[PDB]
Each structure stands twice: as structure tokens, then as C-alpha cells.
Design a protein around this ligand. Sequence first.
Ligand code: CMP
Ligand code: CMP
Lengths: 533, 148, 533
Amino acid sequence: MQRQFTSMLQPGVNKFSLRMFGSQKAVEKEQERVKTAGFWIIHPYSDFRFYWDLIMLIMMVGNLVIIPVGITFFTEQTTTPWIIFNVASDTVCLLDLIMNFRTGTVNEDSSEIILDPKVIKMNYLKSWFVVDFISSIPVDYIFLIVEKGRALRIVRFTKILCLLRLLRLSRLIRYIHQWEEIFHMTYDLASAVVRIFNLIGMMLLLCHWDGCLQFLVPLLQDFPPDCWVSLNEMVNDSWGKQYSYALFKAMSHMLCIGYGAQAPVSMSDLWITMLSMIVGATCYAMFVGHATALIQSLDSSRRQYQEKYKQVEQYMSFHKLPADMRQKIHDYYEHRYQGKIFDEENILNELNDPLREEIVNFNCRKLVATMPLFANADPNFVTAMLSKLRFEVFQPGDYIIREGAVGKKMYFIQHGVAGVITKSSKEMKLTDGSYFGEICLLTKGRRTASVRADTYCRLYSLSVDNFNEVLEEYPMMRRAFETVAIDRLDRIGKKNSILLQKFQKDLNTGVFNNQENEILKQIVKHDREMVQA
Amino acid sequence: IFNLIGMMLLLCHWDGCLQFLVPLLQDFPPDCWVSLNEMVNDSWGKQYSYALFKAMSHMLCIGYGAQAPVSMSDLWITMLSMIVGATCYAMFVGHATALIQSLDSSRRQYQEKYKQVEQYMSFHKLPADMRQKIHDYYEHRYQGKIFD
Amino acid sequence: MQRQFTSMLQPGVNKFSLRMFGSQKAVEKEQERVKTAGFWIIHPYSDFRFYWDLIMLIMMVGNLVIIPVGITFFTEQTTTPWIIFNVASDTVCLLDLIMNFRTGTVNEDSSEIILDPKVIKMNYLKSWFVVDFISSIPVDYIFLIVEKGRALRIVRFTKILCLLRLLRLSRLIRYIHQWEEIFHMTYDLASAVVRIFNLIGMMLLLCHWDGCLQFLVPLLQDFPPDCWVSLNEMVNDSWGKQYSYALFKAMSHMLCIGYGAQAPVSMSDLWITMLSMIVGATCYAMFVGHATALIQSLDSSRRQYQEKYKQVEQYMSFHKLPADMRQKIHDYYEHRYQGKIFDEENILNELNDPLREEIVNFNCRKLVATMPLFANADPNFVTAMLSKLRFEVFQPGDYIIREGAVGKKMYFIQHGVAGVITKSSKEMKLTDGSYFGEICLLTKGRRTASVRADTYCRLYSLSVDNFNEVLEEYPMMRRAFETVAIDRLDRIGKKNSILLQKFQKDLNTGVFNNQENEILKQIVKHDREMVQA
Ligand SMILES: Nc1ncnc2c1ncn2[C@@H]1O[C@@H]2COP(=O)(O)O[C@H]2[C@H]1O
Ligand SMILES: Nc1ncnc2c1ncn2[C@@H]1O[C@@H]2COP(=O)(O)O[C@H]2[C@H]1O
């Protein structure tokens, strides 16, 4: 029995323990720390704590609802089921009070308190012991026994002292908050939804309590003729009708609907009504605030994008761009972001190297599969090349490369078809997967031919600095780039002596040409087949 | 919000005093609410309680006292009280909304960050397992806290 | 018939398909994928889906409004038009239920489900089939036929079962949400407006339903004497008056106005009233939240600028600047941003190279047209020079260049007139288009003369690093800059030997002076004419 009880009395390896502690090792360290101190000391995150708190929440929810009804609307409620229920709740509350002295505390400094006699007992005694004690002992039964050891005074005192059990709302709120924060940090719960559900539960409880009180106050006054119960002539009505009307009055005060049958007449009725109105107005204002917060949190993703585009529109209005230019900017913004807010330069920075590598490899899977030069070399080179590419979107008809300008980047086409146009040759179509801009980076010269975006082109651009940095690590890939750059230059206008000298020097050198020649031939054939489309 | 609560209590008290001062200065005309409710000779406690009840009912948008105003002075005093109470309650709702928004800013900012991350993942159309891995890493690295 | 039906049953090339898929090619790929699977399988984005959903929305809007009125306020509503309307709605709902088994699904993982027998049917059956089925079959007519195969019970059961058709609200909400998100991602709709219109429609529908229910409940109870209908003596009134009063009571409960004629008396009336109050209070809180969100989203552009300027004021207060300095800061902020929030360094970064080039060329069109050195050279150089300029604003009387200091940037005047002041010569006015600061960057020395801002000067500054980077690519422009720098230095104080040696070396060299001399002469003449103002 001791082993099974202890195994559940200490924290167990699960989702929440894995997110709390570093790993399994820290979980076992915490288990050993819990097992070391005291005979039985309950960890706040243990399964026994969870089940005991679930039982306590169920009991308090069932008690805070039934006690006021059984006290107010029921006369001479000292029947066997009532004493049985009261005694059961009393003993469960006493057991909870006892177990609270061996449960530890979660300090706000991210620490767990385990030491029993010096900090556990000495902190619960000076924080919540009096509230958890005067709401746990049967004060009404103690007073009845004392007096028994003219009955209107006794009945009134018993009914008044039975309201001390309503202080269990403190324990209910504490347990609800603790386990809701635990579930919040375990699951992906929304803060606004949890808070609005807490407020809805509190509003229902307060409305029920106000409904009970608006009849308890006339009941304690022996139903004066000025009270609403006597005016409506429902003194002898059934408990269901009385409770329904009292709850109706309380909820009408809460939701700002008005009064019951008429305006209050007696002073006690006036003050009870005004207190109920204050409580209900405060609760409804809090509910409106929570609803506003929830509605604002629901559409944050779209609202942020709308704010970004409104800032863009403000910039365009400041610079006084024409209508067609503004339409082009809108089209590009709506084709590039597609109505979504994010920033890759920071999202990818928040991730680690393996996750970023996996995401980039998944993004360019078709580019790797289609590229003749990719998928046929060292995959470390492949991931190094892919980790430096930048996503770009070019609208149809946009000159993405202009001849005569200096070369600073090349592009790998992922989506769409581009067109290479030269002043001395017909345009050649480049489909998906193909790439351009190699010769400008290789020869460090000007662009040879222009490139047009025939359709909406989604391209991956590689800067010259990153290209040289990744290519100085891998020269076989540089020779593979040259073996097709020379071919393309000879196809357009030759004048490729800068790369031709290096290629001839490599051919004359004793390099591993047995596989290099085959790789170059395959790459050239695939590139010319792709460009022949 | 505490300043506004104090101001609301003070204004409700002043309105309660005024709704009886105005009939008092008019020597309790028969059309006034005091004469209609027959509380002219009542004790000061009952009169103050009923006047404060009327003022607070106007403030919190609950309705009127015994009945709708009849005299013109009663009508205009009631309408001024309704205007003041409605303005005060709108300000109170605004302050409550601001307080509730400021209470959960730390969690809301993290939720916004993770929703932006999810939007990025949806834009790039990552598979389910990759999205689960990203979620696990984000929840094991930041532990639900926003900072940089 | 098959060709025309299929051409509209698959997605068509339009605005929304262009924003969904990459381009026309992906649209045709999706069309082929849809045409491949199944005999007839409806794509969610097809025109047939849109028109069928429009018909369904019209029918459900016309049905959820008329069914409660025809059930509650009309006695013995089994006339030919009613059966015709019910049968038409029934068959349209059954056709919609049948077509929902061949419509696919838009997965949250940005995917389209097309496979008919394994995932389309097996997902709609376990998600919404029971709700879409018990709200589609005529349960009331089936029960009537079964019973026909003491009439108060039959009438009550028929009226109760006729409320199962109100579950079409689920289909209405689903279709509205789907097509509103489609229009949101198609057009530039505002999220707050769409959400508040959805909530307004829901509030109207719920108010209408509550108005119908507050009379249906007394009707089912055969108008007890405690009901509000009997108390108001409107049992025999016309249907218009009864509906008007019931809707008035429901809307008064919804908008927190109060009750009808008086407070409820019967228990059923009390509970119906309390449920209506709860629903109306929740709806009004949601409406207040939506209104707050809409109002906050309406003035975001101005609010962000106000927040920025309040942060600036907080910084000034922290540093305890004098009143005149704070006024100067305010004047500069209000003359530079003009009350608009944006950040060019990020807005231009979110754009591509062609769009940025077009925007910059439009911004400096007058500068290009007016500059003698611009508009007469390679336009690649022109755009390279323009892409590196930075916008600056100088208030009148501000010393923008101080003599003796090191040179780090030059300025191109776009708006306003500046004044070159020297300790040994009178001030010379520089109008729009003219530029200064060349000699400090060219000779790498100190400034020769000071420059003052006579009016509000809007200038474009070019850093020394960017200037040298763009000028090492184009030397003819460097010689053109020198040919006027030497002239200006000789005009002020000569001592231009650093550039004079290079100019003499170029003149002695065999450079293409035939056009260079003419260009230099024209540039010098235009510059001196501009400076002679
Ligand atoms: N005949 C061709 N087939 C395919 N691509 C080409 C051809 N000619 C040139 N290109 C590419 O088009 C690019 C245009 O600019 P670059 O001169 O920088 O580099 C060029 C090559 O990458
Ligand atoms: N006579 C002049 N006419 C027009 N501009 C001048 C004249 N003298 C000097 N400048 C410009 O004024 C600038 C002041 O600072 P810098 O010496 O850097 O470079 C100077 C020239 O660009």
C-alpha cells in the first residue's frame, strides 16, 4: 500500500512535468527530493493532488449551490439527508484542511517548498488557515449544542451561522486558479476564453447567491408587510415558485433590466436592492470588458495584417504615388504575403539549426528534385546552399534582370516561367526548377541578357557574397557551374574567355575527370533540355 | 478605475441629495415624487435611502423610482441624472475593459507571437508532423513566456 | 450538357483562384486533379458551388424567418401554400444534403480533399450529417402520417417537431463563414465590419426567434390565465398585433430596456423571460465588444502616430529639453512625417527590386529631369545612384554643412532653396535640382564652405561609401563630377590641385574626349546658370 500510495503522491513523468522540469532526469531529481523530506509530503503537481482537488471542486460546487437554497427556502431543514450531507461536506473539508498542511507551495520565484515544519506549516497558518478553518467547522451545530446544553432567535442564529460555509468560495477560487494555470501551461488554452468562463461561473454563482439573499432577508425579518414577498402574496407559495421569483429579481438587477413586481418600499428591501444593483452592474461591466478582450484576441492575425497594409497605404499617400502604381503595390503585397502577417527573418532566427534546415529543405524539395545540379552531390552542400536563399515574388512583365548592369545575385525559379531576352537572339523560356544569373557572379562582369517575368514568378535569390562563401568550400560545384556557364555564353555570344581559361587549366590538370566529365555532360544536357521548352 | 469609482460614488451621492433638494426648494409641490410617495414627513434616513436609490437606479440604468416623473422639474432633474449616470457607466465600462486588457498582456503577447508563427507555417504549408515539432520546440524553448 | 456542366463544376481562372494557386498553371493542375477523381465531384471554389450556396442562403434566410411565424401565430396552417413552401424547402435541403457528399473539403493544412469514397463521405458522415439530416427530413409530416395510419396533442407535437427545421441555422452559419472568408481573401474587406455584420444578423435572428417563442410557449399551454397574452387580453387579436407585441417584449429583453406590460407571473413566463434576458445580455455584450473593436480599428493609423509622438515627448521630458527645443522638434516631426506613420527602411525592404526602382524613379523624377548630370547618361547608373539616396528635411536657418568638418555625404536638393556661405565670398543661392558636397567626397578633405537652409529644405543625401561604390563602376561620371568640382573650387578659392592633377592626366591620356568635353561644358554651363540664380 505504501509503495502504490507514494508512487502517486510524488510528481509523475507526464506532459506538465516535462514542460516544468528540464527533462526526465530533473523529474526524477524532484521525485527524490519529495521522497527525502517528511514522512508523507504531497507535491502540488502529483496525481493525488489533482484527484483530491477534483473531488474538492465537485464538492464545493455542489455545496455552494445547495446550502443557500436549503437554508433560505426550506423551513426546519434538520432532516436526516441534510445532516448527512452537512457531515459529509464537513469531514471532507476537514480532510482537505489537514492535507493542506502537507502539500507544499509553488513560490512565485519558480521554486517548490517541501520543508514541512518550518515553511509549509508556518506559511499556511498565516495566509489562509483562519478562512479555511471557520468555513470547515460546523459552527451552527456547535452553537446549537451549546445552547441546548423563543426558538425564533435560535433559528435566526443557525441560519446566519450556516452562511459561514459560503467561505469555501476562497478554496474553490484558489483551486480553480491553480489548476487552470496548470492546464494553461500544459495545453494550448486561450487566456481570454478561460477568463471569460471564470467570470461566467462567478456571475452565475453571485446571481444565485443574490436570489437566495433577496428571500433570506425577508425571512429573517419574519416577513414584514412591507417586504416584496408579502406584497406579492407568495409567503405560502411553494419553494420552486419563490426561488424562481427571487432568482428573477436578482438576475434582473444583475443584467440591468429593472426591478421585480414594483420598486422597493421597505428600507431593508431598498438597501438589499441597491447592493444587488451595484454587484450586478460591476459584474456586467467586467463581462463586457472580458467580451471585448476576447473579440479583440479572436481576430488579431487579420488585424495585424490590416494595420501593416494601412501603414503601407499611408506611406504611399505620403509619397503621392499614382493610382496604377498603388494598384501594382497592392497586387504585389496581396500576392507575396497572401493576407498573412509574419517575418521570416525573425521566425527562422527563433528556431535552431536542425529545424531551420528541415523547414528550408521542405520548402525547396521540388527545387532539389528538379535541379540537375542538386540531388547529385554532397547534401551538406545542398543544405548550405538552401539555407542562404531568399524568397522573392516578381509580377508579370517586370524586368528582373537588366543587361549591362552589375551582377549581385542569381535566381532559382521555384514557380512560374521566365524569359531570357537578348538584343541579338530570340527569347528562351525557363520553366520551374531552372536558374539564371550564374555568369554575372562567376565572371564578376555585367549582365549579358535581360530576364522578363512572363507570369507571377516565385523565385529564390542567392547573394553574390553568400554564393562565393558557400562555393569556396566546394569547388567541384564551381566547375559544374562553369561547365554550363561557358555553354550558355557560347550559345548567346561566346566571349567566355575568363571562364574558358580556368576550364582549360582544370582539364589540363590531373583532376578526377572520370566522374566530373560525366556529371558535367549530364548537367549540360538537362539544362539544355529544360531551356529548350 | 479607483479614481473613477470614487467619482461615481460621489456623483451618485450628490444626485441623491439633489433629487430631494429640488422638491425641497419648491416647497414640495403635489406633482413631486416626494408628495406622490407620501414621504414628506418620513424620517431623514428613509428619505435619503429612497433618494439615493433613485439616483443609483438612474446611474446604473435600472429605471426610475416609484413611477415616471410627472412635473417638469422632476423630468429635467431625472434626465440630467440619466445623462450623468450613463456617461459615468460608459467610462466605468471603458476603464474595466482597459484593466482587463492590461491584466493578461503577458499571455496575450505570447499568444499573438505563436499565432504569427502558425500563420507563417500555414503560408509555407508545412506538414502536420513538422508543425507539431515546431510547436513542441516553441513550447520547450520559451515555455509560454514573451521576451527577447 | 456534360461539357458545360463540368466547365462550371471545376474551379475557374479568376481573382480568387489566382490568389489561391500559384498561377494559371496551378489552376489548370487543380482542374485536372478535380476532373480525374470521381464521376462528378464538386470543387469548393467552383462557380456551381457559389451559385448553389447562394440559392441555399436565400432559401434558409427566407425559411428561418417564416417557419416560426407560420408555426406560432397561425392556427391550422396546413393550407396549400404552406405545404408547397415546406415541400420546396424540403427538396432543396435534400438536394443540398446529397450534393454535400460530392463537394470535397478545405483542410486547415492548406489542402483540398477530392477522394470521394474514403475521406469525403467518411468525414461528412461523422461531422455534420446528423444535423443536416434531422433538419432536412419532414419529421412533422412523417409523425402526422404515422399517427393517422384529442387533436390538441397532435397539434402540439406537430408544432414542436416543426422546430427541427430551425437547425438549418448550422448550414446557414457554415456557408456564410466559408463564403465570407473567401470574399475576405478575394476582396479587401475589413474584418471588424464583416464580424459586426454577422453579429447584427445573428442578433436580429435571435430577437425574432425569442419573439416567436414568447408566444409559442403560452400557445402550447393553451393560454393559461397567468400568461401575458391572457393578462393583456390579446388572445383574439390579429396576428400582426400579437407578433408586434411579442417582438417588442423580446427586443426589450435583448437591449436591456425592461419587460412588457408587467413583470412575469407564471413560472413558465418567468423562466422564458429569464432565458431571453440571458441571451439578450450576452448578445448586447458581444455587440459592445464588436463595436469597440471596430472603433479601435477605424483610427489605427492616427493612433499609432499619436503613440509615436507621445514616446518622443516622453524622451524629451526625460532629457528635460527647453521649450524652444521641444517646439523645434515638434515642428520638424510635423514637417517630416506630416502626421503619417510608416518606416521606409522596412516598407522598401518588403518590396522587390523592380517595384523599389519604380517608386524611387517616380520620387526623383523632377530631380532626374532637372539635373544636368542626370538624364544624359546610362540609366542603369541613374537608378543605381537613386536607389542609395536618403530623404532628409532641414528646417530654415539650420547649418546643414559646417566648414572645416570632415566630409561624409553630399546632398541633392529636391525642394527648397539653400545658400552657400563662405568667409571670403558672398552667399550663392542653390535652387531645386542643384546639389552640393561633391568636393569633400572627391578630395577626401574638409568642407570648404558652409551651407544654410533658407527655407524648409527637402534634400536627398548620398553617403560617401555608397557614392564611391556606385562611382567606381562608372568613371565617366566621376570625371563629370570633377569637371565641375574644379570649377567651383576655382570660383571660391582654387587650391584644387588634387583633382587638377587627375583631370590633367585624363586630358593628356587618349580618352574619348570628343563627347566628354561637350558633356563637361554643358554640365558646367548648366551648373553655373543654376548657381547664378
Ligand atoms: N540560352 C540560354 N538558355 C537558358 N538560360 C540562359 C541562356 N542564355 C542566358 N541564360 C541565363 O539568363 C541569364 C541572364 O542574365 P545573366 O547574363 O546574369 O546570366 C544568364 C544565364 O543564367
Ligand atoms: N560658387 C558655388 N556655386 C554653387 N555651389 C557651390 C559654390 N561653391 C561651393 N559650392 C557647393 O557648396 C558646397 C559646400 O560644401 P563642400 O565644400 O562640401 O562642397 C561645396 C559645393 O558643392
